[PDB]
Design an enzyme around this catalytic site. Structure first.
Site, PDB file in Angstrom:
ATOM      1  N   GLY F 135       4.926 -30.961 -12.249  1.00  0.00           N
ATOM      2  CA  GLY F 135       4.467 -31.677 -13.423  1.00  0.00           C
ATOM      3  C   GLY F 135       3.765 -32.987 -13.130  1.00  0.00           C
ATOM      4  N   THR F 136       4.207 -33.705 -12.097  1.00  0.00           N
ATOM      5  CA  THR F 136       3.522 -34.936 -11.718  1.00  0.00           C
ATOM      6  C   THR F 136       2.217 -34.636 -10.994  1.00  0.00           C
ATOM      7  OG1 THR F 136       4.757 -35.092  -9.648  1.00  0.00           O
ATOM      8  CG2 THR F 136       5.701 -36.139 -11.585  1.00  0.00           C
ATOM      9  N   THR F 170       8.273 -20.490  -6.575  1.00  0.00           N
ATOM     10  CA  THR F 170       9.512 -21.266  -6.732  1.00  0.00           C
ATOM     11  C   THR F 170       9.563 -22.051  -8.049  1.00  0.00           C
ATOM     12  OG1 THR F 170      11.067 -22.767  -5.578  1.00  0.00           O
ATOM     13  CG2 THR F 170       8.725 -23.250  -5.242  1.00  0.00           C
ATOM     14  N   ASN F 197       1.128 -21.650  -0.073  1.00  0.00           N
ATOM     15  CA  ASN F 197       2.268 -21.932   0.791  1.00  0.00           C
ATOM     16  C   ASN F 197       2.644 -20.720   1.628  1.00  0.00           C
ATOM     17  OD1 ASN F 197       3.130 -23.842  -1.926  1.00  0.00           O
ATOM     18  ND2 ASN F 197       3.041 -24.769   0.114  1.00  0.00           N
ATOM     19  N   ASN F 219       3.955 -29.230   7.041  1.00  0.00           N
ATOM     20  CA  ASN F 219       3.209 -30.473   6.919  1.00  0.00           C
ATOM     21  C   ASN F 219       2.622 -30.917   8.250  1.00  0.00           C
ATOM     22  OD1 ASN F 219       3.969 -30.382   4.266  1.00  0.00           O
ATOM     23  ND2 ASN F 219       5.558 -31.950   4.455  1.00  0.00           N
ATOM     24  N   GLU F 245     -21.462 -34.876   4.185  1.00  0.00           N
ATOM     25  CA  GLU F 245     -21.853 -33.607   4.785  1.00  0.00           C
ATOM     26  C   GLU F 245     -21.011 -32.448   4.260  1.00  0.00           C
ATOM     27  OE1 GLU F 245     -25.240 -34.557   7.119  1.00  0.00           O
ATOM     28  OE2 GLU F 245     -24.427 -32.660   6.395  1.00  0.00           O
TER      29      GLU F 245
HETATM   30  N1  LIG Z   1       2.484 -27.584   1.282  1.00  0.00           N
HETATM   31  C1  LIG Z   1       3.558 -28.143   0.734  1.00  0.00           C
HETATM   32  N2  LIG Z   1       3.942 -27.796  -0.543  1.00  0.00           N
HETATM   33  C2  LIG Z   1       5.036 -28.363  -1.106  1.00  0.00           C
HETATM   34  C3  LIG Z   1       5.783 -29.297  -0.409  1.00  0.00           C
HETATM   35  N3  LIG Z   1       6.801 -29.686  -1.204  1.00  0.00           N
HETATM   36  C4  LIG Z   1       6.713 -29.026  -2.381  1.00  0.00           C
HETATM   37  N4  LIG Z   1       5.626 -28.197  -2.329  1.00  0.00           N
HETATM   38  C5  LIG Z   1       5.136 -27.298  -3.385  1.00  0.00           C
HETATM   39  O1  LIG Z   1       5.076 -27.981  -4.617  1.00  0.00           O
HETATM   40  C6  LIG Z   1       5.327 -27.079  -5.672  1.00  0.00           C
HETATM   41  C7  LIG Z   1       5.990 -27.784  -6.845  1.00  0.00           C
HETATM   42  O2  LIG Z   1       5.543 -29.117  -6.909  1.00  0.00           O
HETATM   43  P1  LIG Z   1       6.478 -30.294  -6.345  1.00  0.00           P
HETATM   44  O3  LIG Z   1       5.722 -31.196  -5.409  1.00  0.00           O
HETATM   45  O4  LIG Z   1       7.689 -29.709  -5.671  1.00  0.00           O
HETATM   46  O5  LIG Z   1       6.902 -31.127  -7.643  1.00  0.00           O
HETATM   47  P2  LIG Z   1       5.785 -32.078  -8.283  1.00  0.00           P
HETATM   48  O6  LIG Z   1       4.417 -31.450  -8.196  1.00  0.00           O
HETATM   49  O7  LIG Z   1       5.812 -33.389  -7.555  1.00  0.00           O
HETATM   50  O8  LIG Z   1       6.254 -32.304  -9.800  1.00  0.00           O
HETATM   51  P3  LIG Z   1       7.627 -33.088 -10.085  1.00  0.00           P
HETATM   52  O9  LIG Z   1       8.770 -32.386  -9.398  1.00  0.00           O
HETATM   53  O10 LIG Z   1       7.847 -33.148 -11.576  1.00  0.00           O
HETATM   54  O11 LIG Z   1       7.547 -34.480  -9.520  1.00  0.00           O
HETATM   55  C8  LIG Z   1       6.222 -26.001  -5.094  1.00  0.00           C
HETATM   56  O12 LIG Z   1       5.763 -24.736  -5.504  1.00  0.00           O
HETATM   57  C9  LIG Z   1       6.085 -26.131  -3.592  1.00  0.00           C
HETATM   58  O13 LIG Z   1       5.546 -24.950  -3.054  1.00  0.00           O
HETATM   59  C10 LIG Z   1       5.401 -29.648   0.878  1.00  0.00           C
HETATM   60  O14 LIG Z   1       6.050 -30.473   1.516  1.00  0.00           O
HETATM   61  N5  LIG Z   1       4.289 -29.069   1.444  1.00  0.00           N
HETATM   62 MG   LIG Z   2       9.570 -34.264  -9.199  1.00  0.00          MG
END
Ligand SMILES: Nc1nc2c(ncn2[C@@H]2O[C@H](COP(=O)(O)OP(=O)(O)OP(=O)(O)O)[C@@H](O)[C@H]2O)c(=O)[nH]1
Ligand SMILES: [Mg+2]
Ligand SMILES: Nc1nc2c(ncn2[C@@H]2O[C@H](COP(=O)(O)OP(=O)(O)OP(=O)(O)O)[C@@H](O)[C@H]2O)c(=O)[nH]1
Ligand SMILES: Nc1nc2c(ncn2[C@@H]2O[C@H](COP(=O)(O)OP(=O)(O)O)[C@@H](O)[C@H]2O)c(=O)[nH]1
Ligand SMILES: [Mg+2]
Lengths: 428, 35, 45, 426, 161, 428
Positions: F135-136, F170, F197, F219, F245
């Site tokens: 959501g963020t 997820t 992912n 990462n 570029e």
């Molecule tokens: N490539 C990568 N994807 C990630 C990582 N952590 C979370 N995700 C992906 O992020 C998706 C969900 O978004 P999140 O970053 O976990 O949560 P958000 O986008 O910050 O939203 P909020 O939880 O409300 O703050 C999941 O489907 C994960 O696959 C990461 O470290 N690397």
């Molecule tokens: Mg969050």
């Protein structure tokens, strides 16, 4: 030769200058007993051999804080006769501070003024430090200025008024004190510097990031912003600006001399490890609404004239680059009756700091000083504050019982209204 | 006061005194008249 | 007041020197001729 | 007999002539104590032009310094080559001029002009007669342009036929310190035009541009800028102090430059100018140097020369060089820039040769060109002033101190007249 | 002067270090009690502060000398095991010298001496070379900025030089 | 001079960005505080006495991912209020993060963006980082793109979005968030590339032979893609490639600006033993569909444009020889309106390993980014997944409650079907 007489009235005035004269003696290296272990002569007189006496006078009607300075740390540098104790407080009344109990102190204070100014020729200005909301700060604060305009009518009476916040005022009859002293402060001062409580509260929360300020933490910042104003007076610089010059480049009409300030950087030790204190960014960091000393948003205001004086090892080349950066900015919309709007003061002295205070050090300190048309809103909230309390003549029986007759409440309404419309007719 | 040598020479304009000077084999004055 | 012994914060020095038009760049094999230089010139086996 | 008396008005003049007396001291071989040095007989045989004998073998400058603040003139005394001047030459002020042309000129300046005309007339009359004066001042500052222009006005009726030759620092367009600029610049030109014989225009931001691009430095101080302009300001008066193949004093520069007696604003340049990384691969010859002359990147005024049809020009070379390498290339500028030199004056440009160069130079030059291209300078001072004046603010002090409406409108109409003959002789 | 004697400083691995060992390191005294609930809430934050800022470091930057307010040998060593940095043994003369020197004692005031304030548990007093208070970190003070005042450490200007 | 500001939103971009700056700090030889014992100018700024700071901001709406970094080992690396954190998590809500809670932090988030942009003139642009899963990253991320576009017009906005994996994501409300997060991402970001992912997951099995790693092991692989992408602008090269570029050589039409990624080789301390890693075979291992890090199989698609960045002791004749065998390779089919479809870039340094990581010392590597017609399938299956949510209004009351009405979802359907039609017509 060169001298300036500092006057403090009210409890805000006494403790603001309690931090100012601490920061002044910290600059010159003198031990605060008066002994040093030619540039200090604008703030201190020499009395004998190695003894430094301040050019300050302490005034109030209530003796619980003049005697606290007397018994405090600075008992001997502050010679015991510069301080004056009153009988009883003005008690949040302009009428008490001006008419009834102010007559027994104004005679002694003015007898001090002309016997502190007759010592040497070349008197330059006065630094009047007053609180507009307080009863003796506006009462004895007012009473000193018309008497100073009668005898020293051809000199500069620069003022430092702590305007109240829209929400934080810590007194009920406070807006009654502000309306009824500003009109009488108007044509008797020539430069007015308005600060605010909640504005510097927001500063201490945001960029110096203390969750927990108090009045002395207010006093570190105001003592710094006065010191940067007087930096070119005491010491040497490239383009030195003096007391007779702050009004030369800010006040276009004799009526419009009320004016804001700020300071940059206002940082901690962990807040200086990580970023430029460059000239190209300090001016940007001193112009946002989250940086000035009056919480007055200038985005719907219009900048008019501003001194931007520096202190430290700084060159006017990247100063000139930062000036063109501001003029090309569209959000800071300057007025159309002056394409030029700047002064860049400059001085070589490194920014002093107090060991113990949270304001960390830097080799560039910048005080922004600005006249603007945004004052229309900060006085308009002050006007409708009075109109709601004056609906059925509230808190007026205290004032008319002191001898201040009903009727000079009322021209203070249309005199501040005439001042309020002055901002619109200069911004058109 | 920042009294270090590089700053004080900068305020004293010594840098321009260095680089308006011509750094080569310069002074050419021979007397062409013969006895 | 004797707590003034302190290295100054916000560490910029104001660059009095010449500005760096040319920073040290690693000139290496692909921008290094040789090879055909002695093939066009036959410096002998 | 050929005497120049120096006047340094205000904080501008004191520090811009602090560098001039520095670069003319070591050029004339003089130590900071005052006595003579410098291993050359050229510099002693004409030493009176800037110096007087102090009955001890010590040479003291012929400089009188204006200020109403003792701050910056105490600093030049502490600085090197500041004890050269005799202490009676300074005049002290105590009130301080507030960058206000009214404050410097009329009300408290009159209590010091009686105290400084009596010392500049004693300096002037000590010789049999004098060739002229040089006066250094600004136009954005009141202690430099209040006593600066008023000293020009009274020396006109004191000495009615000896020249005044003033180096004027003009308000820079882009950056603007000391925000009351047009009330000083417009109200000082309008008496400079009829009471000064030569005025040389120097811009602050143009000095900024020529040291950042052409002279190629990152961030020097202001003291490096003063060394740039005082080097050319010394080269203007090289003939009065040293011999040459082609003698040309300051009045020789007068007659050959000003065609009509009312316009006398000149462009001032200096060459060669290059950086530390750009010294050793460059050529030093009159061909490349006269080409380095004629561009906006050399001009110390921020008026574009390509927008102005050149009225007259002059170049005083310094050093040992051939005259035909001077004047075939000096003609070569004329026929290459066909549209850039005014047609009804044939051979718009003149040259002169000093046989000595400045120290560390071989062929140097100063470029005194009376170009018409200062329409842009004078018209935007007047555009800023007419934005200042249609509204009556920053002016109620001037009315309260003793003026009226008619003298601002006199200066505005006079400055509109400055623009007016520039394009119609162009 | 020589603030500490030859056999006073006392660190982990049970060995003594002399006073010249503190050369060029930010030196601070930790007036703390073993069973004090302020110290329970504050010691983990000093442990992380000591962790990250000098482990991710080019030189040794921080030393903290625990100086104890406890009541027993066994209570002293039990708090000792949870803590790696320098310290001072409780029953040397040193603890009660820096106690009155830095005004850090625990409402035992009148039965010992007739001075005023106490500014007691907890406190960290970062100090200079000559036994001077360098600056106060306000955990429990007028600021009372507990658990966060460690960020107000001025480590560049406070050196044991 | 050369400058780029890496902006991160969402906690996915938080420890992706943590791996980014631990790789940048290690590559440039600077310290976890920042003191190292013009080359660093594009990511770090010289701020202090031999001390540097990152040019990044960390923007998340909830504290536990920001403040744990602020209490971690890199607490004196970052300027501590560049790491801005909100009060309450958006909790998988575009509606909350874009309409009712985003405004509480974006006023100060932009406020820090134009410190870093003002610090030097000559920005190539911004390294946008987000995941559209949450959501963020969706909501507060998308709001950041309109305001960055209206403030800064012609600067590059090069976005790395962690696109959800197709078969699992997820999350449950995921098809609602992304199909309208890409609604305004079409017209506000410039150079965006998909990162699935599960594609990073199954290249870890096949190449690295690693079966249970964590997000941070992903990462490390992402951060190597960051470093190889901008090391041509960072350090000198035979054929340097800037951010402007990457616009030039990738995107055919302004709407179709989504690409894919690949990074070959990715080998362990077992395969680096026994394999030779010449350019002529690692390019085959970069163009293979199994090494794709978005699960977009190119076999049923037409390649439009392809870019490659090489790091190490690469000779350009091996670049020419490797791309020659690719053109003759018959299953890798290039579109008929782009006969010449390659950008190549050369850098001298080998990739820098994280000690204790799952990479090996490899002399030469490839970072490939390609715009392909085949990437319409990850939006075709996403279109189908949103349809059986929106058929009878699942989770609609959460998003209508804080800012949108019923109709913005179907208005997001219209330009996503317009995206599918634009992809179909260009792939003809
Ligand atoms: N490539 C990568 N994807 C990630 C990582 N952590 C979370 N995700 C992906 O992020 C998706 C969900 O978004 P999140 O970053 O976990 O949560 P958000 O986008 O910050 O939203 P909020 O939880 O409300 O703050 C999941 O489907 C994960 O696959 C990461 O470290 N690397
Ligand atoms: Mg969050
Ligand atoms: N900026 C600033 N304002 C202060 C300070 N102390 C008091 N004030 C202001 O002073 C106003 C009231 O005046 P006081 O200082 O309390 O008292 P006074 O000035 O002696 O006048 P009396 O109320 O009659 O005693 C309040 O509204 C405060 O905002 C201070 O330390 N800094
Ligand atoms: N000579 C000199 N000129 C300056 C200085 N600062 C600014 N100026 C330029 O001169 C104008 C200000 O006048 P200034 O000489 O400083 O004031 P003065 O002291 O009254 O003569 C501005 O337009 C600036 O462009 C300075 O320190 N010295
Ligand atoms: Mg009191």
């Amino acid at each position: 030769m060169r001298e300036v007489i500092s006057i403090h009235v009210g409890q805000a005035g006494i403790q603001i200058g309690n931090a100012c004269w601490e920061l002044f003696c910290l600059e010159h290296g003198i031990q605060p007993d008066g002994q040093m272990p030619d540039a200090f002569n604008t703030f201190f007189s020499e009395t004998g051999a190695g003894k430094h006496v301040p050019r300050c006078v302490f005034l109030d009607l209530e003796p619980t804080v003049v005697d606290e300075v007397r018994t405090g740390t600075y008992r001997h540098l502050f010679h015991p006769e510069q301080l004056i104790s009153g009988k009883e407080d003005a008690a949040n009344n302009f009428a008490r501070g001006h008419y009834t109990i102010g007559k027994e102190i104004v005679d002694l204070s003015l007898d001090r003024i002309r016997k502190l100014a007759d010592n040497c020729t070349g008197l330059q200005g006065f630094l009047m430090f007053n609180a507009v909301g307080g009863g003796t700060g506006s009462g004895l604060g007012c009473l000193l200025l018309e008497r100073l305009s009668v005898d020293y009518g051809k000199k500069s009476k620069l003022n430092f008024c702590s305007w109240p916040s829209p929400q934080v005022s810590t007194a009920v009859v406070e807006p009654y004190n502000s309306v009824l002293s500003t009109h009488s402060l108007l044509e008797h001062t020539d430069v007015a510097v308005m600060l605010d409580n909640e504005a510097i509260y927001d500063i201490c929360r945001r960029n110096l990031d203390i969750e927990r300020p108090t009045y002395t933490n207010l006093n570190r910042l105001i003592a710094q912003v006065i010191s940067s104003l007087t930096a070119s007076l005491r010491f040497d610089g490239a383009l030195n600006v003096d007391v007779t010059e702050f009004q030369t480049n800010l006040v276009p009409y004799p009526r419009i001399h009320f004016m804001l300030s700020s300071y940059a950087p206002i940082i901690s030790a962990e807040k200086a490890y990580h970023e430029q204190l460059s000239v190209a960014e300090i001016t940007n960091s001193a112009f946002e609404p989250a940086s000035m000393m009056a919480k007055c948003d200038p985005r719907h205001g219009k900048y008019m004239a501003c001194c931007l004086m520096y202190r430290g090892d700084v060159v006017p080349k990247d100063v000139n680059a930062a000036v063109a950066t501001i003029k090309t900015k569209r959000t800071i919309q300057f007025v159309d009756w002056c394409p030029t709007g700047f002064k860049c003061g400059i001085n070589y002295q490194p920014p002093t700091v107090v060991p113990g205070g949270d304001l960390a050090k830097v080799m560039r300190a910048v005080c922004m000083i600005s006249n603007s048309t945004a004052i229309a809103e900060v006085f308009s909230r002050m006007d409708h504050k009075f109109d709601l309390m004056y609906a059925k003549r509230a808190f007026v029986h205290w004032y008319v019982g002191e001898g201040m007759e009903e009727g000079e409440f009322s021209e203070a309404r249309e005199d501040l209204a005439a001042l309020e419309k002055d901002y619109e007719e200069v911004g058109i | 006061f920042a009294q270090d040598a590089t700053r004080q020479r900068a305020l004293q304009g010594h840098r321009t005194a260095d680089l308006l000077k011509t750094p080569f084999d310069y002074d050419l004055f021979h007397r062409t008249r013969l006895p | 007041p004797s707590a003034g012994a302190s290295i100054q914060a916000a560490g910029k020095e104001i660059d009095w020197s010449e500005k760096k038009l040319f920073r040290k760049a690693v000139v290496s094999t692909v921008f290094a001729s040789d090879q055909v230089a002695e093939r066009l010139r036959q410096d002998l086996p | 007999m050929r005497e120049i008396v120096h006047v340094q008005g205000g904080q501008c003049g004191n520090q811009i002539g602090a560098k001039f007396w520095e670069v003319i001291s070591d050029e004339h071989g003089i130590d900071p104590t005052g006595t003579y040095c410098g291993d050359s007989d050229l510099q002693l045989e004409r030493i009176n032009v800037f110096y007087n004998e102090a009955t001890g073998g010590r040479f003291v400058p012929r400089a009188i310094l204006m200020d109403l603040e003792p701050g910056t003139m105490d600093s030049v005394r502490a600085g090197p080559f500041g004890q050269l001047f005799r202490p009676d030459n300074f005049v002290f002020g105590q009130t301080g001029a507030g960058n206000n042309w009214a404050k410097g000129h009329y009300t408290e300046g009159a209590e010091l002009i009686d105290s400084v005309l009596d010392v500049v007339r004693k300096e002037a009359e000590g010789c049999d007669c004098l060739q002229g004066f040089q006066i250094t001042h600004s136009l954005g500052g009141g202690t430099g342009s209040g006593m600066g222009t008023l000293l020009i006005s009274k020396v006109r009726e004191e000495y009615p036929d000896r020249i005044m030759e003033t180096f004027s620092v003009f308000p820079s367009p882009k950056v603007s310190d000391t925000v009351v600029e047009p009330y000083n610049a417009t109200l000082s030109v309008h008496q400079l035009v009829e009471n000064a014989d030569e005025v040389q225009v120097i811009d602050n931001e143009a000095l900024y541009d020529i040291c950042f691009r052409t002279l190629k430095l990152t961030t020097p101080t202001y003291g490096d800028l003063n060394h740039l302009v005082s080097a050319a300001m010394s080269g203007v008066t090289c003939c009065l102090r040293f011999p040459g193949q082609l003698n040309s004093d300051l009045r020789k520069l007068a007659v050959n430059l000003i065609p009509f007696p009312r316009l006398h604003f000149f462009l001032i340049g200096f060459a060669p100018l290059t950086s530390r990384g750009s010294q050793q691969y460059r050529a030093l010859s009159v061909p490349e140097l006269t080409q380095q002359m004629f561009d906006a990147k050399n001009m110390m005024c921020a008026s574009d020369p390509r927008h102005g049809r050149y009225l007259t020009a002059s170049a005083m070379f310094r050093g040992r060089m051939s005259t035909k390498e001077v004047d075939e290339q000096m003609l070569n500028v004329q026929n290459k820039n066909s549209s850039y030199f005014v047609e009804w004056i044939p051979n718009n440009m003149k040259s002169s040769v000093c046989d000595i160069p400045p120290k560390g130079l071989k062929m140097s030059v100063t470029f005194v060109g009376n170009s018409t291209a200062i329409q842009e300078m004078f018209k935007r001072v007047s555009d800023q002033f007419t934005a200042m004046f249609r509204r009556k603010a920053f002016l109620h002090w001037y009315t309260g101190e003793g003026m009226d409406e008619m003298e601002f409108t006199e200066a505005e109409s006079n400055m509109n007249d400055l623009v007016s003959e520039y394009q119609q002789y162009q | 002067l020589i603030l500490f004697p030859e056999g006073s400083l006392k660190n982990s691995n049970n060995t003594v270090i002399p006073q010249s060992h503190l050369k060029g390191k930010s030196v601070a005294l930790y007036f703390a009690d073993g069973a004090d609930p302020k110290c329970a809430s504050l010691l983990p934050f000093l442990l992380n502060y000591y962790r990250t800022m000098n482990e991710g470091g080019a030189n040794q930057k921080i030393e903290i000398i625990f100086v104890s307010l406890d009541r027993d040998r066994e209570a002293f060593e039990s708090h000792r095991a949870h803590m790696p940095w320098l310290s001072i043994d409780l029953e040397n003369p040193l603890t009660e010298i820096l106690k009155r020197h830095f005004r850090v004692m625990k409402e035992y005031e009148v039965p010992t001496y007739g001075y005023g304030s106490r500014t007691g548990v907890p406190s960290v007093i970062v100090i200079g070379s000559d036994g001077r208070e360098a600056q106060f970190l306000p955990i429990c003070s007028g600021l009372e900025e507990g658990d966060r005042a460690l960020l107000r450490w001025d480590w560049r200007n406070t050196k044991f030089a």
